[PDB]
Amino acid sequence: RLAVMVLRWSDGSYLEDQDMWRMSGIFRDVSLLHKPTTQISDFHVATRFNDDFSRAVLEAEVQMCGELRDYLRVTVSLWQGETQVASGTAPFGGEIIDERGGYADRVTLRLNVENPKLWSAEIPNLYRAVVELHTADGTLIEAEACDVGFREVRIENGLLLLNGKPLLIRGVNRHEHHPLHGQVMDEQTMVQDILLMKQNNFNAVRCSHY
């Protein structure tokens, strides 16, 4: 048996003064997750490029919890549909960081990618990255994953650039709102919103304000 006591007002309310209906309760999903004792506790993906965007390096930093052992390994593999395009494997124990050493519970994998398909709102090219925690010998402990889009965002000479070209933001602000269910969100509604946006020449959205 679970018992949850939900307060309408708290000291948190002082920082939640958005121009919207003020409601309360458990308005998003509740779930239960099972992880091993030795587990993946965090992971970061980065993509950086050469000047013409014909070569990329994908960089993935992974962290673990549990007991540290020499047999432990991470493999990050990059997939495009059913084709594996790159892969890296390494033992834990990052670069030396200061006078006391490095993170023995962390590892960085770097994968080279030639002529990468780039992500933009015009053509949303995606790769699938799979992060496996395992033994030297190849026995899986667990796996996490995410979608990867190869893109660069930088400001130069006063212009916001995406993949080297100057952006033109056709954007809108969107609160999470439904007339019957209040501030509860569902997939059917979200998909309905995105289709209407794109059918009406919008290319960007702001999560106003949370």
Partner 1 sequence: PNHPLWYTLCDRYGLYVVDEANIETHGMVPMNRLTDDPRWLPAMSERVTRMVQRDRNHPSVIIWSLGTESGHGANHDALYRWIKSVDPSRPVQYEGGGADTTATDIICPMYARVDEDQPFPAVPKWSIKKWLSLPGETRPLILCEYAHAMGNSLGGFAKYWQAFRQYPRLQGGFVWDWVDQSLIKYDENGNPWSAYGGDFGDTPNDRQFCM
Q: Which residues are annotated as a binding site for substrate?
A: 19
Q: Give the span between the Cα atoms of 111 and 62, in whole angstroms.
A: 14
Cβ-based nearer residue to Mg ion, 173 or 200: 173
Residue recorded with tokens 């509740």: 30
Instruction: Using alpha carbons, select from 38, 45, 88 the residue that is nearest to residue 64.
Output: 38
Binding of Mg ion by 14 (CB under 5 A): no
Residues that bind partner 1 (CB under 8 A): 157-159
Cβ-based nearer residue to partner 1, 139 or 157: 157
Minimal distance, residue 22 CB to Mg ion, in Å: 13
Minimal distance, residue 156 CB to partner 1, in Å: 8
| Burial of 144 from C-beta contacts in 10 A (0-12 / 13-18 / 19+) | middle
- Asked whether the beta carbons of 52 and 163 are under 8 A apart, the reply is no
Segment 15 to 44, residues that bind Mg ion, using CB under 5 A? 19
Q: Which does 81 bind (CB under 5 to 8 A by kind): partner 1, Mg ion, none?
A: none
The alpha-carbon radius of gyration of the chain (Å, integer) is 22
Minimal distance, residue 17 CB to Mg ion, in Å: 7
Q: Site residues (CB under 5 A) for Mg ion?
A: 19
